[PDB]
Amino acid sequence: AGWQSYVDNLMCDGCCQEAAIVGYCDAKYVWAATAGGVFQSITPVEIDMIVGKDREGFFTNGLTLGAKKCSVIRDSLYVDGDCTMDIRTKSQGGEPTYNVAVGRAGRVLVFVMGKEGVHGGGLNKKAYSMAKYLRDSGF
Amino acid sequence: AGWQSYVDNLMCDGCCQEAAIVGYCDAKYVWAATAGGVFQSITPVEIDMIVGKDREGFFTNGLTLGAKKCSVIRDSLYVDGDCTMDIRTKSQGGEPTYNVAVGRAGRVLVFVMGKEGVHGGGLNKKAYSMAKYLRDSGF
Amino acid sequence: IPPPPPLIPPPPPLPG
Ligand code: NA
Protein backbone atom coordinates (compact mmCIF):
# COMPACT_ATOMS: atom_id res chain seq x y z
CA ALA A 1 0.00 0.00 0.00
CA GLY A 2 2.71 2.44 0.93
CA TRP A 3 1.63 6.06 0.64
CA GLN A 4 -1.77 4.88 -0.63
CA SER A 5 -2.71 4.18 2.98
CA TYR A 6 -2.26 7.87 3.76
CA VAL A 7 -4.50 8.82 0.81
CA ASP A 8 -7.07 6.35 2.15
CA ASN A 9 -6.96 7.81 5.63
CA LEU A 10 -7.60 11.25 4.13
CA MET A 11 -10.58 9.93 2.16
CA CYS A 12 -12.23 7.69 4.73
CA ASP A 13 -14.54 10.16 6.46
CA GLY A 14 -16.32 10.75 3.12
CA CYS A 15 -15.98 14.50 2.88
CA CYS A 16 -13.32 14.53 0.21
CA GLN A 17 -13.48 13.76 -3.48
CA GLU A 18 -9.66 13.36 -3.77
CA ALA A 19 -6.43 13.41 -1.78
CA ALA A 20 -2.74 13.27 -2.44
CA ILE A 21 0.73 13.02 -0.89
CA VAL A 22 3.26 15.11 -2.83
CA GLY A 23 6.97 15.55 -2.20
CA TYR A 24 8.57 18.93 -2.35
CA CYS A 25 12.24 18.10 -1.58
CA ASP A 26 14.33 15.36 -3.39
CA ALA A 27 11.34 13.58 -4.87
CA LYS A 28 9.43 16.66 -5.99
CA TYR A 29 6.42 15.05 -7.59
CA VAL A 30 3.21 13.25 -6.62
CA TRP A 31 3.82 10.15 -4.47
CA ALA A 32 0.22 8.93 -4.17
CA ALA A 33 -3.13 10.37 -5.22
CA THR A 34 -6.73 9.45 -5.93
CA ALA A 35 -6.62 7.83 -9.36
CA GLY A 36 -7.80 9.83 -12.36
CA GLY A 37 -8.31 13.09 -10.50
CA VAL A 38 -6.75 16.54 -10.56
CA PHE A 39 -4.15 16.03 -7.90
CA GLN A 40 -2.50 13.08 -9.67
CA SER A 41 -1.68 15.60 -12.43
CA ILE A 42 0.09 18.15 -10.19
CA THR A 43 3.37 19.18 -11.80
CA PRO A 44 6.74 20.06 -10.31
CA VAL A 45 6.19 23.62 -11.49
CA GLU A 46 2.88 23.76 -9.61
CA ILE A 47 4.62 22.37 -6.52
CA ASP A 48 7.19 25.14 -6.81
CA MET A 49 4.40 27.72 -6.84
CA ILE A 50 2.84 26.21 -3.69
CA VAL A 51 6.10 26.13 -1.74
CA GLY A 52 8.00 29.09 -3.25
CA LYS A 53 9.25 32.22 -1.54
CA ASP A 54 6.72 34.45 -3.26
CA ARG A 55 3.63 34.31 -1.01
CA GLU A 56 1.64 37.10 -2.78
CA GLY A 57 1.47 36.59 -6.49
CA PHE A 58 -0.94 33.65 -6.19
CA PHE A 59 -3.54 35.88 -4.47
CA THR A 60 -3.70 38.22 -7.43
CA ASN A 61 -2.90 35.54 -10.06
CA GLY A 62 -4.32 32.34 -8.67
CA LEU A 63 -2.43 29.15 -9.31
CA THR A 64 -3.08 25.85 -11.05
CA LEU A 65 -3.23 22.31 -9.77
CA GLY A 66 -3.20 19.67 -12.46
CA ALA A 67 -3.70 22.58 -14.93
CA LYS A 68 -6.98 23.49 -13.14
CA LYS A 69 -7.25 27.17 -12.22
CA CYS A 70 -7.59 27.86 -8.54
CA SER A 71 -7.69 30.76 -6.15
CA VAL A 72 -5.65 31.09 -2.93
CA ILE A 73 -8.02 31.88 -0.04
CA ARG A 74 -5.48 31.89 2.83
CA ASP A 75 -1.75 31.24 3.02
CA SER A 76 -0.19 29.93 6.18
CA LEU A 77 2.22 27.42 4.63
CA TYR A 78 5.27 28.95 6.32
CA VAL A 79 3.46 30.00 9.51
CA ASP A 80 5.08 27.76 12.11
CA GLY A 81 2.44 25.85 14.05
CA ASP A 82 0.07 25.95 11.12
CA CYS A 83 1.73 25.12 7.82
CA THR A 84 -1.46 25.08 5.77
CA MET A 85 -3.01 26.80 2.80
CA ASP A 86 -6.63 27.15 1.76
CA ILE A 87 -7.34 27.05 -1.98
CA ARG A 88 -10.51 26.91 -4.08
CA THR A 89 -11.11 25.88 -7.67
CA LYS A 90 -12.40 28.58 -9.96
CA SER A 91 -15.77 28.22 -11.72
CA GLN A 92 -15.81 28.95 -15.40
CA GLY A 93 -19.61 29.21 -15.85
CA GLY A 94 -21.23 28.68 -12.43
CA GLU A 95 -20.50 24.97 -12.05
CA PRO A 96 -19.57 24.14 -8.49
CA THR A 97 -16.24 24.95 -7.03
CA TYR A 98 -14.36 22.83 -4.54
CA ASN A 99 -12.22 23.71 -1.56
CA VAL A 100 -8.63 22.44 -1.38
CA ALA A 101 -6.42 22.33 1.71
CA VAL A 102 -2.70 21.86 1.75
CA GLY A 103 -0.55 20.89 4.71
CA ARG A 104 3.22 21.06 4.70
CA ALA A 105 5.38 18.64 6.64
CA GLY A 106 9.16 18.55 6.36
CA ARG A 107 9.40 16.53 3.18
CA VAL A 108 5.87 16.23 1.86
CA LEU A 109 2.68 18.11 1.17
CA VAL A 110 -0.77 16.80 2.01
CA PHE A 111 -3.51 17.75 -0.44
CA VAL A 112 -7.26 17.29 0.08
CA MET A 113 -10.20 18.37 -2.10
CA GLY A 114 -13.74 18.58 -0.68
CA LYS A 115 -16.94 17.27 -2.21
CA GLU A 116 -19.46 19.85 -3.30
CA GLY A 117 -20.57 21.98 -0.39
CA VAL A 118 -17.79 20.92 1.89
CA HIS A 119 -16.32 23.93 3.59
CA GLY A 120 -12.66 24.72 3.89
CA GLY A 121 -12.45 24.68 7.67
CA GLY A 122 -12.80 20.94 8.10
CA LEU A 123 -10.48 20.32 5.19
CA ASN A 124 -7.89 22.59 6.77
CA LYS A 125 -8.13 20.59 10.00
CA LYS A 126 -7.61 17.38 8.02
CA ALA A 127 -4.57 18.70 6.16
CA TYR A 128 -3.15 20.30 9.32
CA SER A 129 -3.59 17.04 11.25
CA MET A 130 -1.94 14.76 8.72
CA ALA A 131 0.91 17.16 8.05
CA LYS A 132 1.46 17.41 11.82
CA TYR A 133 1.48 13.62 12.16
CA LEU A 134 3.99 13.30 9.34
CA ARG A 135 6.11 16.11 10.76
CA ASP A 136 6.16 14.50 14.17
CA SER A 137 7.21 11.24 12.45
CA GLY A 138 10.16 12.83 10.72
CA PHE A 139 8.49 13.48 7.35
CA ALA B 1 -0.13 -3.98 -3.58
CA GLY B 2 2.40 -2.16 -5.63
CA TRP B 3 0.29 -3.28 -8.54
CA GLN B 4 -2.11 -0.45 -7.66
CA SER B 5 0.47 1.93 -9.13
CA TYR B 6 -0.20 0.29 -12.49
CA VAL B 7 -3.89 1.00 -12.11
CA ASP B 8 -2.97 4.58 -11.23
CA ASN B 9 -0.89 4.87 -14.39
CA LEU B 10 -3.68 3.51 -16.58
CA MET B 11 -6.13 5.99 -15.02
CA CYS B 12 -3.94 9.07 -15.10
CA ASP B 13 -4.99 10.50 -18.46
CA GLY B 14 -8.62 10.86 -17.36
CA CYS B 15 -9.99 8.77 -20.25
CA CYS B 16 -10.63 5.58 -18.27
CA GLN B 17 -13.46 4.72 -15.92
CA GLU B 18 -11.55 1.76 -14.48
CA ALA B 19 -8.41 -0.33 -14.92
CA ALA B 20 -7.06 -3.59 -13.62
CA ILE B 21 -4.13 -5.96 -13.51
CA VAL B 22 -5.30 -9.58 -13.55
CA GLY B 23 -3.22 -12.76 -13.40
CA TYR B 24 -4.16 -15.44 -15.89
CA CYS B 25 -1.73 -18.28 -15.02
CA ASP B 26 -1.38 -19.76 -11.50
CA ALA B 27 -2.43 -16.56 -9.65
CA LYS B 28 -5.50 -16.50 -11.88
CA TYR B 29 -7.48 -13.70 -10.22
CA VAL B 30 -7.54 -9.93 -9.94
CA TRP B 31 -4.29 -8.48 -8.62
CA ALA B 32 -5.27 -4.80 -8.51
CA ALA B 33 -8.31 -2.93 -9.81
CA THR B 34 -10.27 0.30 -9.57
CA ALA B 35 -12.60 0.04 -6.56
CA GLY B 36 -16.31 -0.08 -7.31
CA GLY B 37 -15.92 -1.14 -10.92
CA VAL B 38 -16.82 -4.33 -12.67
CA PHE B 39 -13.17 -5.24 -13.03
CA GLN B 40 -12.71 -5.77 -9.33
CA SER B 41 -15.18 -8.69 -9.55
CA ILE B 42 -13.66 -10.48 -12.53
CA THR B 43 -13.63 -14.22 -11.77
CA PRO B 44 -11.28 -17.07 -12.66
CA VAL B 45 -13.83 -18.55 -15.06
CA GLU B 46 -14.14 -15.17 -16.76
CA ILE B 47 -10.36 -15.02 -17.09
CA ASP B 48 -10.33 -18.54 -18.60
CA MET B 49 -12.82 -17.30 -21.24
CA ILE B 50 -10.58 -14.37 -22.14
CA VAL B 51 -7.39 -16.44 -22.45
CA GLY B 52 -8.59 -19.93 -23.42
CA LYS B 53 -8.07 -22.06 -26.44
CA ASP B 54 -11.48 -21.40 -27.84
CA ARG B 55 -11.21 -18.13 -29.77
CA GLU B 56 -14.67 -18.52 -31.34
CA GLY B 57 -17.31 -19.09 -28.68
CA PHE B 58 -17.19 -15.63 -27.21
CA PHE B 59 -18.19 -14.18 -30.61
CA THR B 60 -21.35 -16.23 -30.43
CA ASN B 61 -22.07 -16.28 -26.71
CA GLY B 62 -20.43 -13.01 -25.56
CA LEU B 63 -18.52 -13.00 -22.32
CA THR B 64 -18.84 -11.35 -18.92
CA LEU B 65 -16.45 -9.24 -16.85
CA GLY B 66 -17.47 -8.91 -13.23
CA ALA B 67 -20.78 -10.52 -14.34
CA LYS B 68 -21.36 -7.63 -16.73
CA LYS B 69 -22.38 -8.83 -20.23
CA CYS B 70 -20.01 -7.77 -22.97
CA SER B 71 -19.34 -8.31 -26.67
CA VAL B 72 -16.00 -9.19 -28.28
CA ILE B 73 -15.11 -6.69 -30.97
CA ARG B 74 -11.65 -7.91 -32.01
CA ASP B 75 -9.52 -10.79 -30.81
CA SER B 76 -5.74 -10.46 -31.32
CA LEU B 77 -4.83 -11.90 -27.92
CA TYR B 78 -2.52 -14.50 -29.41
CA VAL B 79 -1.36 -12.39 -32.41
CA ASP B 80 2.33 -11.88 -32.10
CA GLY B 81 3.33 -8.28 -31.62
CA ASP B 82 -0.19 -7.32 -30.68
CA CYS B 83 -1.60 -9.46 -27.85
CA THR B 84 -4.77 -7.38 -27.38
CA MET B 85 -8.50 -7.86 -27.46
CA ASP B 86 -11.17 -5.22 -27.84
CA ILE B 87 -14.41 -5.59 -25.96
CA ARG B 88 -17.56 -3.51 -25.39
CA THR B 89 -20.09 -3.66 -22.59
CA LYS B 90 -23.70 -4.49 -23.54
CA SER B 91 -26.38 -1.89 -22.89
CA GLN B 92 -28.75 -3.51 -20.46
CA GLY B 93 -31.20 -1.00 -21.68
CA GLY B 94 -30.68 1.56 -21.18
CA GLU B 95 -27.29 2.84 -20.31
CA PRO B 96 -24.37 3.82 -22.50
CA THR B 97 -21.88 1.24 -23.64
CA TYR B 98 -18.23 1.39 -22.64
CA ASN B 99 -15.24 0.17 -24.59
CA VAL B 100 -12.76 -2.18 -22.97
CA ALA B 101 -9.26 -3.12 -24.10
CA VAL B 102 -7.22 -6.08 -22.81
CA GLY B 103 -3.48 -6.53 -23.22
CA ARG B 104 -1.84 -9.92 -22.54
CA ALA B 105 1.66 -10.13 -21.05
CA GLY B 106 3.28 -13.38 -19.99
CA ARG B 107 1.71 -13.62 -16.53
CA VAL B 108 -0.88 -10.88 -16.40
CA LEU B 109 -3.66 -9.17 -18.31
CA VAL B 110 -4.09 -5.42 -18.48
CA PHE B 111 -7.71 -4.21 -18.56
CA VAL B 112 -8.90 -0.68 -19.27
CA MET B 113 -12.44 0.67 -19.61
CA GLY B 114 -13.04 4.04 -21.23
CA LYS B 115 -15.38 6.62 -19.90
CA GLU B 116 -18.59 7.25 -21.77
CA GLY B 117 -17.83 8.27 -25.34
CA VAL B 118 -14.19 7.25 -25.25
CA HIS B 119 -13.44 5.18 -28.33
CA GLY B 120 -11.52 1.94 -28.45
CA GLY B 121 -8.43 2.83 -30.46
CA GLY B 122 -6.76 4.89 -27.72
CA LEU B 123 -7.70 2.29 -25.18
CA ASN B 124 -6.13 -0.44 -27.30
CA LYS B 125 -2.88 1.52 -27.53
CA LYS B 126 -2.85 1.92 -23.74
CA ALA B 127 -3.41 -1.77 -23.13
CA TYR B 128 -0.89 -2.75 -25.78
CA SER B 129 1.87 -0.51 -24.45
CA MET B 130 1.46 -1.57 -20.86
CA ALA B 131 1.29 -5.24 -21.74
CA LYS B 132 4.45 -4.87 -23.80
CA TYR B 133 6.24 -3.07 -20.93
CA LEU B 134 5.26 -5.87 -18.58
CA ARG B 135 6.23 -8.65 -20.98
CA ASP B 136 9.70 -7.15 -21.34
CA SER B 137 10.10 -6.98 -17.56
CA GLY B 138 9.29 -10.70 -17.23
CA PHE B 139 5.58 -10.37 -16.41
CA ILE C 1 1.36 -12.67 -6.43
CA PRO C 2 4.82 -11.33 -7.20
CA PRO C 3 6.01 -7.75 -6.66
CA PRO C 4 5.83 -5.55 -9.79
CA PRO C 5 8.58 -4.03 -11.83
CA PRO C 6 9.19 -0.34 -11.11
CA LEU C 7 7.05 1.95 -13.29
CA ILE C 8 9.79 7.76 -3.11
CA PRO C 9 10.81 7.05 0.48
CA PRO C 10 9.02 4.46 2.57
CA PRO C 11 6.34 6.13 4.72
CA PRO C 12 6.35 6.19 8.46
CA PRO C 13 4.03 3.79 10.27
CA LEU C 14 0.39 4.62 10.80
CA PRO C 15 -1.20 4.22 14.26
CA GLY C 16 -2.10 0.77 15.57
NA1 NA D 1 -10.89 -10.72 -34.24
What DSSP letter does each residue of A27-49 carry, written as one string? S-SEEEE-TTSSGGG--HHHHHH
Residue numbers in C near A138 (CB within 8 A): 12
Resolution (A): 1.1
The residues with which B70 forms a beta bridge, in sequence order, are: B63, B89
Residue-range domain boundaries for chain A: 1-139
Task: Domain A1-139: give its CATH superfamily.
Answer: Dynein light chain 2a, cytoplasmic (3.30.450.30)
What is Dmax (Cα atoms) for chain B? 42
Half-sphere exposure in the Cβ direction for A31 (13 Å, CA): 24
Give the 3-state secondary structure of residue B27. coil
Q: CA of B119: how far to CAs of A38, B21, B113, in Å? A: 22, 21, 10
C11–chain B Cβ distance below 8 A for any pair: no
- Encode A50-71: b = buried (16+ Cβ within 10 Å), e = exposed: bbeeeeeebeeebbbbbebebb
| Residue A78 · residue A55 · CB < 8 Å | yes
B94–chain A Cβ distance below 8 A for any pair: no
Give the 3-state secondary structure of residue C10. coil
B126: left (phi over 0), alpha (psi -120 to 50) or beta: alpha
The length of chain B is 139
Residue numbers in B near A41 (CB within 8 A): 12
DSSP string for A66-78: TTEEEEEEEEETT
Q: CA of B110: how far to CAs of A3, B6, B25, B120, in Å? A: 23, 9, 14, 14
Residues B34 and A9: their CA atoms lie apart, in Å, by 17
Which residues of A fall below an 8 Å CB-CB distance to C? 2-3, 5-6, 9, 23, 27, 31, 107, 134, 137-139
